[model samples]
Target chain A: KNPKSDKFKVKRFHHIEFWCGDATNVARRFSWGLGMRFSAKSDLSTGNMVHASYLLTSGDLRFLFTAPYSPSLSAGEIKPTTTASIPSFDHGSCRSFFSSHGLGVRAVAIEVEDAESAFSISVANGAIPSSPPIVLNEAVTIAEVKLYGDVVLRYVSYKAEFLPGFERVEDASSFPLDYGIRRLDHAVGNVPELGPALTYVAGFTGFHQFAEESGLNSAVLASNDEMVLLPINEPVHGTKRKSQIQTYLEHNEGAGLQHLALMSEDIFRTLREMRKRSSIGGFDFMPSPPPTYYQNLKKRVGDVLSDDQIKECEELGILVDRDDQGTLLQIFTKPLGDRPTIFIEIIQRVGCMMYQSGGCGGFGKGNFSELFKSIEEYEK
Target chain B: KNPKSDKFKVKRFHHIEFWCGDATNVARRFSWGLGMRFSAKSDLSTGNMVHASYLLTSGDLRFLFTAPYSPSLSAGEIKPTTTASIPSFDHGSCRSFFSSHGLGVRAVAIEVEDAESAFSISVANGAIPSSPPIVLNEAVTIAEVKLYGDVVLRYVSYKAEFLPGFERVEDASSFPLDYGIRRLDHAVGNVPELGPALTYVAGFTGFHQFAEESGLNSAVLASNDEMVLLPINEPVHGTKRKSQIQTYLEHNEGAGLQHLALMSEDIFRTLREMRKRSSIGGFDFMPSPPPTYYQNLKKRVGDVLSDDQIKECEELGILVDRDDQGTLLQIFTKPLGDRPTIFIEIIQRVGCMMYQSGGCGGFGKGNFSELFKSIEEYEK
Candidate 1:
């Protein structure tokens, strides 16, 4: 059993925000690529002079994309009054983040029982406070602490539809075709060292180690209810070639959020749709696993997946692995942008009896080498 | 009557280069939106340690989108070998350009008879040299000089498919359904003052003023043969409200390329396809001109366009205007990114027997006020 945080009670992920160069186009691209609907927005039209923001959602998942406006206008024109207290709205920080790391996540928000208590406890326990707890509106309170690299850990408690100042997009269209995506399964960060990062996250959030992989020095940490999982990774130096984790750090300019694993009820159909969309605007997944890897999957995963399912997995380039609890089916996209830094993962967990919380198949520790090999070949 | 410089002889637009934060995605977005085909690329996989670049083309139009790589590696790793001399590939300049002007054109390249003579003559004529003429390969020679704001005017003479060091994307798919775009009609730049910019360009390239508009102090400069048109604009300060030209300067952080005009043979079908793609990954055009503007179309443009054609223009939001020579049809897209800076124009000319060079419809001077009014209303 993992020791829970005595400081504050945690719920689940609130939302993740990305600081990019062009929020309008990136938001639209994401909406078309993934079946996420445009739920809300805030920009100059909304009297927000700092940056343009967009909120996208699917199921319980929420994503915020923001791009800062240039402060070439007078101080009166650039001043933020209503959204001033929001840390992510800080124009200078957004510019700096984009300068150093192009188009990457800036904040990972987590919902908690009490925002103030969470902020106070984490700060008292050596977390650097990015911003003090502040009430955004009648229904929302939030605070932030620095996380790995330029990213932040945000604690939020809200009863509203989304953050304050974002108006609901009344004319936003609903997706006619569902991609079967449920919610965020886990978020992984790449760091220079694992021990310190793991210790820092565990101390602040009271997350416990759920799984570990050796070649890349990766450790998965989970919340008490196992609702939120963060897997931290560092490169194993002095290898035959440069570690993929190290490549990410170098290209991103520092340690940062590497990828997000989105849970899907049926990955076969989801990936099929994703692949079809990829031809137009969606993401391109990494190359398929080698034939030998797929040939040996049945022996490793056992009867957890049917022969036809395995064939479908091969067809879709999905990787299959299993633990004693259940089976895991997952695949990764190539870097979403040019830097070979951030990416995405699609995962489906089967037969773990923990349908609502912790995944039964563990963290796919057995598939790391194959994934890295495919990535290396792709990069080459 | 206009006086032209006797400096360098120009051909046509060779290519236009954009500096952005995420070139990979932007290139893909443009490919999907405008029906441009991916032609070539240079990136880490191609031993390009400086930046990631993509070449997209439609008809005779070539657009190069480049995003610099973070220089976090050792000196040996970051140094550019083959692409080093190319001014557009300079990593520091690319970073500085994106930081100041988010997602804007950095270079406007014109094909010249002799790049060496062009560079020497322009420098002799008071143009600031950005880079001396350098032969890229046996078939390519290029040079650069500072243009308005941080934008550069590149003089290139090439017999190759594109510049050197870029590998041809053999697997790039050709658009099955053509959008009917012919080539780059013209490219415009916004400046703080029109007089100096016009003088500077005229002195350097020997371009002559083809048309002038008063409301915005707009002047269209064209090559001797009229194959290359460079329209420069400055805001008329004492307007009833803020000029859209001034708005572009502020948001772009300084003077920059305002818009690119793409020519089409049949705009009705072109815009129909563009509108369908805009819903997915293309761009959104500005609000349509008022119904009253269409009501007076026959009185203004004469019998060049039939009533049914004018009605189609209203339905498609296309604007119609004409000079004594021929009739012109054009429509503008909203800003390509978040900033109200750079956008696009789709235009078609009718009854202009001089089809190979200059646009007979003029620069849509009669439609400037209406276009700005629509933009003002849309921005509001």
Candidate 2:
């Protein structure tokens, strides 16, 4: 609990777990979707073991796509209801870890810093890592992926001094120029119960909350109803016990990684590279809004942002509506599975300075009810 | 057991239960496929409610379609698959009473010269009525329908004094003006474990049997390939257990009715009427056939039936082939659930007739492999 005692040494949130029904398909998707570059996978004695890591800022969160066991052992009848079709990515260990785990993901364990020391000082004693720590970078980050029963956690060293735009390292070997990743973006998660999950993340993953100083996220409904802003500490945050995570839980049945927010230094370059790889499954996910949405945008807040920026957002299938203070950068991923609960978002900001506050309010209500309807509509 | 005292009676096989995911659909198919009429329903309030039933027969068995309970509750998850979708039908009481009930049908429980005496005699021991016996008519041919737990036996009169054809019924009744029925065709049932289920039914229902018949009633498939047909004298004519049932047991986690086979004088008229009511969803439960099936049928030797009959059989989607003497008539239902196990079939006959050879060998040995293949295509 003491900063001097090594407990308060905050670190970047590392790997995230996702259960998949078909690990092969999921793995390939991850390789393409996250700009992942696969390597010679480690062939463990018993089960399948794959490894791939993209260089990120001590700021960029690392992710692990884990799929375990056979599907014949699913908990109950596996209904093919769009999202619930696979459990390979969702179960937090006890479920998939024990038996004929299905085709989807089984878990996503995040690797972080000072795991052994962290275990001694933090509430993460609940986690079961794969093994003890090994030095990955000799003097810095440790190679540690723990097994908290079946739900695992991989803990590595931290770069406590870095933030996205202001990252220190330029010539670092881990940071590949090809990826165009400049910094660690926000780490996203799909959990069963948000309150407990958020609490757990804050408690174990070292994620901090706002003390009123932290900013809000923004979003707009149907192009331009009004540029709504989400408060950093809104009382309605997760009010109905509904959020993307809740929907994921309902669809996937439990806690798991939904997606990760990757920060892109150059959107055009990154999009271009992704297109070359033919990983174009994403275009369909973020379809452009109806003409009515644009018409309404014109009617309500006419010419809010400049025409050039508006067209850019429109072309990239992004939403736009900002205040005089700043315009934020954000883009969402297509749903990863049959369920639309989890997805990826790559946000690249140039002049704006806000975490999510400016963006959250404008899209899908900064939370759930909108998604409940949206999901139903999407399904229909 | 002299004739006058009571030994000369036992004539029909009464009702058979066919569990389904949807009783409405089953009723429609039955009406279409066999001209069976959906009978007045008995609801749950009777405490011993049977989900649904349809009635039909020839001059032998007065068949009843017993798809009891709404599938999920009746047999847990074991609803027969309609096409590829899940149907809705309960499967227990009917299964225990009809499929392979062990007792060999305790006296076939037909109403006799003395109703009170018969009831008293059955009750003297551990005889159980699914519900109280309801008398229908008691003039020249005393008629009544009695319940034994979930099983039913409708008695016409004492000692088969009058065997009614389709024409014998009250033409103006809600049912058709055709001959109401004749005798028993063959009753089918479903149980938990075939052997254990057999013991349960035998011990409870007054089904009589001898070993010389080699257990003639129960039907089964040997593994996933061949269909088994055994005969019962005291012992039942039985088949070997198939893997589908094993998986089904795992899927459903329990047992119940598979289906009931009702007799019809005119399959065409019955199916037409049933289809008009929209009950005909399609009854292609048997595995699809190989292209070689017709070739093999043409290649095989011997048959007294007409070529039109053979072509009609194939057109009807009936699984068939010829033998040294004659071919048989038979079909099977799709699994009660997703697993490939348990179904029903309709068979019509003319000669020393095969197929429904008292539920087994219809006298042709050549049909074995072909019939087995007809099922194998789907089993896999």
Candidate 3:
């Protein structure tokens, strides 16, 4: 049993880091494709011997793309040692993780009140410790624990200008023209089984169940402050065909982060810009829902969205859904890499006080079957 | 030591294949960065089962980027198996190669008269066979032999419209705006020791030594028809600092592809377009030569290049060198991925019948020190 007074709290997602083959190119893809600006970097040029990392930012969203250097190629050990006396990023583990899961999220870092306390509390509770607290400098402290599969849950308490190891990239060329993407809405993970994984995450983080969906059996968990939302899904067997979650797990080689839902203010403008750039190396989104779905959209979600808005969604392959609080507009991209594993969701929550109360329009639960059908057709 | 009549002959490079972690993104990078058109693909949708591949082309250049699917996720075995009874691409080997070398060339496929005869002769002439001849329908036949490191030398004889497994990508978005890049000029590899590697390659392919450079101890090998140029380099020990080739070997984990030289007609226009796209995720080239180098350039290169051409080269960071045949204009990109391993070279040959005879000016031997210095500074 855990004491109520000892519970550690998470504020929000600090960033999501992807362990990939080529950070430079991947970072460029996000920059050009999604309109995220390349903000900072840590690499051979910056004395980070373990991996090359680039931090891209838009609004409050920070996406870090990292590629590990071979241990033989490393200059030396990283500075500001951890309590375990191991490097912050183990090159061997990074390589194995990348090889197992191509271009998938490796770390879901969350902002915490006190990283050391949060890590200690989580470990004392049911979480498995990955790395002990690492003090980068006076302004930043960080720690990690295993989240699911090879991914890590990183705890960070920082007052620093930027991530400790990274230097601000001031090159004018690094900045991308804004396309109105705002912040992280939530991150979803695929697991072999939903019950145990959900129990484990809930035990450590004290996150309460927010919503649940059928077919794939997904459970959405919200942080104590209700700022960070994580949806965990597991495949349902005995279906006519394989569940998408099962396909994802098989392709990803294990349970891992499945998709990231990015929040944007103007879904129409953002999707239009992204579609324009798709011809120039941007992402290809899932095909739009059938005509009947859009024709009956107003009847299902009431009069929350305009006819023009619904038509725009139809044209851009955006999906519409709603809950008691507000309306949700979302679209999913096909797999970002070769395997049909990790992808992205661009979402906009309408008429909801988003920052004050997390994910006001829900996780598009109404669009589940339609979205799955689209993915199934695309995969076929 | 063998009969010249039994030697296998290589006509030209069929295509250069890179084994990377994420083929989709890498293909997009090449498509956007170098203005290469995404011409064809073979993946899960096309029933490849083992790996996802995308073929991009410009002029006579074909670059294939492939990423292996996890064996557990493979749908089934490939059809038309090789004589070895193994799949064309072994998923396990692909993973290992990608892990060891990051993003580097896995195969240098050369057009041959007869794939079976090439494989048999090369094996008979002391080349280690990687895979026996694989007949893909009546139009295409292929086989492979081990090259230096993990890379293979593939002999392809084909009359097919495209590579055997690939389906043409007819989407208008797949086509890129032309940037005047013409064809492959040459391919350079780095090995630990020059003598044995050179002797081995020369023995099997019957290629002759064309040119030799001093500091890095490089020897250029030309095919019998003089259409394909292969330069091999080894790091010279006992230098003041580590040789660039030595650095490449370390970062690449072994002997592997060092760079690819792609021929272009107008260096100025190509470089300008590439530079403009660099802001949106294109390759970053090496820094320009110092002002003094440009100031004295006319004295060394003579009037082979106009003053305006010289000024443009300086501005675009293009290197210039000349031999008895003609002048060569070239520029090198920094490492394509995180590791300082595989990169690209954009080259233009002036006043040399390039297709009739291999390599117009040279391999930029004269610019070796300057390029090395620039890379050294960059690595630091």
Candidate 4:
């Protein structure tokens, strides 16, 4: 049965927040690498004495990078003191988290119809509440749930601008051009211990395992129009000698979002831009699928792609995964940071439907298998 | 006597190293922002398990960013452990320093005729030695001296590619472009307590104070040809309500390199490119001079600069200073990172020459006074 007719709906992805050492440079890097524009910011000069946040946006996607002003706190802990004329708030958690984890996604904010009820639902499902639902002025309301590791799942409802307290920025664009990454396709997490994470996601978010087999399993959830999808995954043990999730777990120091796939309308253009940047000794891309996989791809898809498309994909290290009805063109970057935990993926879905489609499409299993093998080389 | 004819011959600035949380993004930023091409790199994959380093170079200016793989060090400390086949050394200083300091200039690598002698000389002058001199494959000799705030003064006599452990990289250029910044004009350090620092610089490096008066004092030291200069400063009380040196000392948490001035061939072009990038909301510029300063500058340097040049300088916030013989063009950027400590200065020599005429060269002290007033606005 098609899942499209079912009524539980997520409106859209609000923003993804990262805990980093330097929010300024991270924002600048995103401007150059990802073609994002600075939309909002808060720093010491902006009255945030404890922490600074810079928000970047493109299309409907938003990324918030927050950095702390002080050190001397334990990982995932914070306590602040006030000074004359300048009051300080507790931003110790970000400072501590950044100290230990290096660079990582700290929270994923999802826009929903009912913030209170959504948060209530999550808390009722054995989830730990991080921040109780609170209304900020007339424009926005927000609540947060503690997810696996130190990550948070934020439920936000906004009437105007961004979440409250952010100063709308007029000049945050680092480049005059855009890379065409329109929105987040999905965010995937890695857990050394999968059951607790999957159970938490399934119970709290009402997302169930739509696809399961081998060492990899994914639970699918989406927005009303399927514009923003979140497909959570965990590597099942005893099925493979090693997995990317295991590397992520080790490098990131625990469970966390492993990769974020950004959807592009014209993925070829995105890949072209990414490839050109990569060629100048810039960032690197994850190794692509071998000839055997594409050979198997030709067998699986049955000659649907043009020779030029296939050739270009091969040249750009892009991978292709075909379902029964349509094809998904994809490419993965080598880990964005020094840690092997987090990376980025660019995807273009052709003639693909999410909730409307009868089947929950694979999370690039064709490409996943390829990635598993490619990462295996590094593992060895 | 020409400074070039001096018997004590040290060469140009060799490179500067930054200790960072993520060398990847830092390198990527330099590749695009500064137009430095990739020169060399070393990491876990390259058999350097302790720390990862990416070397970027443009003209003779080199920047190396090093990131430690592990956490658990103090501010300015690194001591990594061994795991299985992977062996970790004493990387605790780097890891610890980064934990407390975030990103900072770790060392100033200098090219000298005798690195061994330089190291020995510094040690004889009561400087703490970080590493003894070591020759590599008959191509290069290297040594290190611990400086204020754990910064290292590296001495290198190289006849081969980059530092020894690095693999020569081919692809480091992100843009088929150059911003025309040719060399390091000078490196500045901010110290709250200056006696030890000044004593060390004088005894170890033989640099002497060139300028005088006020609560601030500067020392000028450079290579034989005066191609590479390091001007150090410390905040003196009663000079003003606050100084950038004090601000940097507090913000950076200790003594450290305050800024690196990059010399551009053409000030107008560099300022234009930087201003355009800044206009796009990418990076920020340092505070511009007030109208009074420009009016005064017009009075001081009558007819030296054409109307168009002066107008453009005011339009882009570029600062101009003139001596009896020639004029210098300069501009600065607001703190480059999250902390208020480090910033960048872009300068063009124009008709200026160093130590050739009666007066010694400066790092735009004329504009510095304007910056002091501009910073006072933020200080309040």
Which wins on DockQ, candidate 1 or candidate 2? 1
Identify the superior model by lDDT, candidate 1 or candidate 2.
1
- lDDT at B362, model 4: 55
Q: List the residue pairs that clash in candidate 3.
A: none
Against the true structure, candidate 4 has what lDDT?
A: 0.68
Winning candidate number (TM-score): 1
Tens digits of per-residue lDDT for model 3 on B320-372? 87788888888988788888889999998886663446676877787766555
Please tell me how candidate 2 rates in CAPRI terms.
incorrect
- Per-residue lDDT tens digits of candidate 2, residues A31-115? 4444543321211121212211122221244433333322333444333321221112233442233121112233333333464
Residue-wise C-alpha lDDT for candidate 2, range B1-380, written one tens digit per residue:
11122222333343343433223333333333343433333323222222433344344544433333323223333323221111112244433332222112212234345544444444443445433332322332422233322333333344331221112223222244232333344443434435654343333334433121212234321101112111111122244543443343333333423343444455444333432322112233454465456545655522544566556555545555343333455555553222233444455444444433333334233455665664575455
Off by over 4 Å in 2: A1-7, A17-22, A44-63, A68-113, A124-153, A158-184, A190-200, A204-206, A211-246, A268-283, A292-306, A321-326, A352-380, B1-380
Is model 4 an incorrect, acceptable, medium or high docking prediction? acceptable
Question: Which residue runs does candidate 3 get wrong by more than 4 Å?
Answer: A1-6, A74-86, A212-214, A300-302, A354-356, A368-380, B1-6, B75-86, B212-214, B300-302, B353-356, B368-380
Could you tell me the lDDT of residue A325 within candidate 4? 66
| Per-model TM-score versus the true fold | 0.92, 0.36, 0.91, 0.84
Q: Write the per-residue lDDT of candidate 3 for residues A105-145, one digit (tens) a residue.
A: 98999999999999999998899999898777567888999
Q: Give the Å shift of residue A241 in candidate 2.
A: 14
- For each candidate, the alpha-carbon lDDT, in order, equals 0.80, 0.36, 0.81, 0.68
Instruction: Write candidate 4's Cα lDDT for B1-380 as tens digits.
Output: 23343223477678888888778777776666666777788776666655678888777778888777754222244333232111212456766676566678988878888888888877887778887887766778888887678677888886647755678775443345566777777788877667767777666776445442345766665555556576678887666456767667766778888889887767777677666666332357866767666666666655877766678888888887765455677777887778887778887665544434212335666656655655565455
Judged by DockQ cut-offs, the docking class of candidate 3 is medium
All-Cα superposition RMSD per candidate: 3.6, 17.6, 4.3, 5.6
